[PDB]
Paper text:
In the fourth category, both the gateway and secondary pocket are blocked and the inaccessible binding cavity harbors an aromatic residue or a proline in position of Arg24. The second-site loop assumes a twisted conformation in these phosphatases. This architecture is present in the subgroups NT5 (PTPH1, MEG1), NT6 (PTPD1, PTPD2), R1 (CD45), R2B (RPTPμ, RPTPκ, RPTPρ), and R4 (RPTPα, RPTPɛ). PTPs with particularly high enzymatic activity against generic substrates were RPTPσ and PTP subgroups R5, R3, NT1, NT2, NT3, NT4, and NT5. The subgroups NT1, NT2, NT3, and NT5 exhibited a pronounced preference for acidic residues N-terminal to the phosphorylation site.
Protein tyrosine phosphatases (PTPs) play a critical role in regulating cellular functions by selectively dephosphorylating their substrates. The ∼280 residue PTP catalytic domain consists of an α/β structure, and biochemical and structural studies have led to a detailed understanding of the catalytic mechanism (Barford et al., 1994; Zhang, 2002). Key features of the domain include the PTP signature motif, the mobile Trp-Pro-Asp “WPD” loop that in the closed conformation positions the conserved and catalytically important aspartate residue, and the phosphotyrosine recognition loop. Here we report the crystal structures of 22 PTP domains, including two tandem-domain RPTP structures and a detailed structural comparison of this protein family.
Residue numbers in the entry: 638 to 701, 703 to 716, 719 to 913
Write the structure that this text describes.
């Protein structure tokens, strides 16, 4: 039943069949509106012209209203993991980033990119250097710790709301060993990272925020890995094509390239062994 799903997946990477099947799945769920991202006021809060959030599942700021961010909820048959999948903050949407995190009650922010891959700004540094604080509107982030190996970094922070005189604790995990070109050769450092993400998620019932640069590629990989890992614990079949379909119903284009899909498929099969 699960073993049957992993023979189909294994013969599909030999077969060459799962890359073929990947190319058929839609990128945008037909008929889902994405026309806020295209409103004159909101266009410049988007990192790419062609990565917009579905109106139907976008995260709505209490301000007004817009951030490039969607709720993604992943149900496990027979546990509904909540995420907010979002782009990496731009310089001018940093206050929006922290407004979202506060209002949705997140206590964990998973960052899947470095700030400058090749010679390009992929994400704005929206948190202060350790021992530091910085202000984003009425929110003040102060950062206590920075510990991590050559593959990932854990930052312990306090996020403080000055408008509501209150402060919550907050943990950011950043995976810093993604290659500039393509996908990792060995998934073993990434897999370890995903486990950490799960230990600290725990049985908390709030969205974990997860971003890369556009918040569709690596972000889809991370959510596809954590889903696949609970499917396995519950003895449920694992069909990577269907995990992406569920994701894509909730944010367009999750898992961007064939190579990332191949990565997630080969990762899942190595995790099952």
């Amino acid at each position: 039943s699960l073993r049957e799903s992993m023979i189909q997946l294994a013969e599909g990477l030999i077969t060459g069949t799962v890359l073929t099947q990947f190319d058929q799945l839609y990128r945008k769920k037909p008929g889902m509106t994405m026309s806020c991202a295209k409103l004159p006021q909101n266009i410049s809060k988007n990192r790419y012209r062609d990565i917009s959030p579905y109106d139907a599942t976008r995260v709505i700021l209490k301000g007004n209203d817009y951030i490039n961010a969607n709720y993604i909820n992943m149900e496990i048959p027979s546990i509904i993991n909540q995420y907010i999948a979002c782009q990496g903050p731009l310089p001018h949407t940093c206050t929006d980033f922290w407004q979202m995190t506060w209002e949705q009650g997140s206590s964990m922010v998973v960052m899947l990119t470095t700030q400058v891959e090749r010679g390009r700004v992929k994400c704005h540094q929206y948190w202060p250097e350790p021992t530091g604080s910085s202000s984003y509107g009425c929110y003040q982030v102060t950062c206590h710790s920075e510990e991590g190996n050559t593959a990932y970094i854990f930052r312990k922070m306090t996020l403080f709301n000055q408008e509501k005189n209150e402060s919550r604790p907050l943990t950011q995990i950043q995976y810093i060993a993604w290659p500039d070109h393509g996908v990792p050769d060995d998934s073993s450092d990434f897999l370890d990272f995903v486990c950490h993400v799960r230990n600290k998620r725990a049985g908390k019932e709030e969205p974990v925020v997860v971003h890369c640069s556009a918040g569709i590629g690596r972000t889809g990989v991370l959510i596809t890995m954590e889903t696949a890992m609970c499917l396995i614990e519950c003895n449920q079949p694992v069909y990577p094509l269907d995990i992406v379909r569920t994701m894509r119903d909730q944010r367009a284009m999750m898992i961007q390239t064939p190579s990332q899909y191949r990565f997630v498929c080969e990762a899942i099969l190595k995790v099952y062994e």
